[PDB]
Amino acid sequence: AYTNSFTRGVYYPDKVFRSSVLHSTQDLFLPFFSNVTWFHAIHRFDNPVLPFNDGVYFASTEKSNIIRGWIFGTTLDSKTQSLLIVNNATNVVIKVCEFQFCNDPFLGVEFRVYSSANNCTFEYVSFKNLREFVFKNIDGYFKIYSKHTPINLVRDLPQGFSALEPLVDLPIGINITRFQTLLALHAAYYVGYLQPRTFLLKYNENGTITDAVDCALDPLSETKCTLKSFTVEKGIYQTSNFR
Amino acid sequence: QNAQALNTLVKQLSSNFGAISSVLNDILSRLDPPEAEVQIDRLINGRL
């Protein structure tokens, strides 16, 4: 029920073009080599509501597209407005409403996700393959990144490097504490969490992120971050600190 | 050494030194003079 992240979880942190340079940034990223819990939500079912904390990494591999969306809210009750993301086979359903969810939301393929709604604020409509997403909510803005690429291993996330691209910066302004994935039923995915870490990002002539270094993995990475290079020559160097 | 010193001097322009913003125009637009002049004074001291 555990796989390790390897080199997954890199996204473009801004919309600035930089060519043939090396840049250091401080933001929430998935830690390197921190193992990722592999869930089988239904096989005996466990489709629970997990805390959101400061952001959540998500990834999955499916061809039947069983996971249709996610549910976000504080109490998951109609007392306070909640967010609902549903991906139809035709379009996207995004809601921000005081939403009375059920004890076991699912997309009957009936609608037993909820029972009623009181207010509504926001509405928006727009193999062996891995779709990868990053969710975070800062200053009332919901931010989502995406990238699609083929794979050859199912049980575990294959190694490699490919950055995620920005998709939506939605200005709603919702308090958020917990989430739960939405599935269609007549279930394999992963959950990663984001932490504040400093990274080096390598840009090619096209402005494409091609490599990265985590500054807290090991002393060699600390030296690389200090020297602002991917190559370190012979000698002694100081990443000084104390305990 | 010369290039390192010049790069450090150039990169020092982005700091706040305790002010609200590192851009003069933002300070001018977001506030009235009786506090914008204080913020600009702070920035001036840092760059000096």
Next chain:
Amino acid sequence: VQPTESIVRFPNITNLCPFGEVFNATRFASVYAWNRKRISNCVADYSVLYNSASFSTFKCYGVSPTKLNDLCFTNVYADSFVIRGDEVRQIAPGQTGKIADYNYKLPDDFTGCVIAYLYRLFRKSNLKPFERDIQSYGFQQPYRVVVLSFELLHAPATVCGPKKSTNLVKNKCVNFNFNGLTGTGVLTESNKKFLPFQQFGRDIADTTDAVRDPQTLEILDITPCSFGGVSVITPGTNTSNQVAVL
């Protein structure tokens, strides 16, 4: 070198919020059963309503009609109800009478503009601001009044007034403010290639280098205007008074 002309360019102010759904519609509800209209996810262009003809009154409270195009608020409410001409003063902060204390009470701290039918004659408690707790009055004059209540909260704001994202806009050799970018310099067509989500370019010194045209998605190099010191060449004054400058 001083800048020559300041052609600051911003895209079209689109889209347009449906003000005509309330300001320009045909039905206004009763004063004791007033309808509050929620306005969001749109550009609130107040020039059309301010410049609209045949308006009996145009009263602002803490706001200016020429200024509202530059205010961004999270939530704006369009209160719509029928009232008679004589009681049009009841929609005011602190005003008393039948309508305010029985039908429609406006907050004493109201901020916005009021632009311009059943009597409740018996109450047990004075109505709160924006309260609707639901004597027939015969129109033998009615005035259609809309109240613009501007509420700002800690949520992201959705109704400002200016252009949003995707419209038509140009660029020249300017001083050279576009959108959120400022500063002077000369602009040249650039051969660089941005990613579709990339808008700016930056040098190793973390300085703006190139910018993409918002309308015709082309990238322009930013070269600053020339500058330099000036020196004066001269022999001794006891030899001549001629000089040459560099």
Next chain:
Amino acid sequence: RDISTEIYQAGSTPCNGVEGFNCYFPLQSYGFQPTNGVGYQPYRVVVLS
């Protein structure tokens, strides 16, 4: 110190010396009464430079 009473124009249509839509007389008379509140009571203020 400006001492003028021209009808202010907030619109593009000229006032032609009358009040109306967007047209205002700049001055409003002070409603000083013995029944007024403390904050609306008249106050004699002297400025020394």
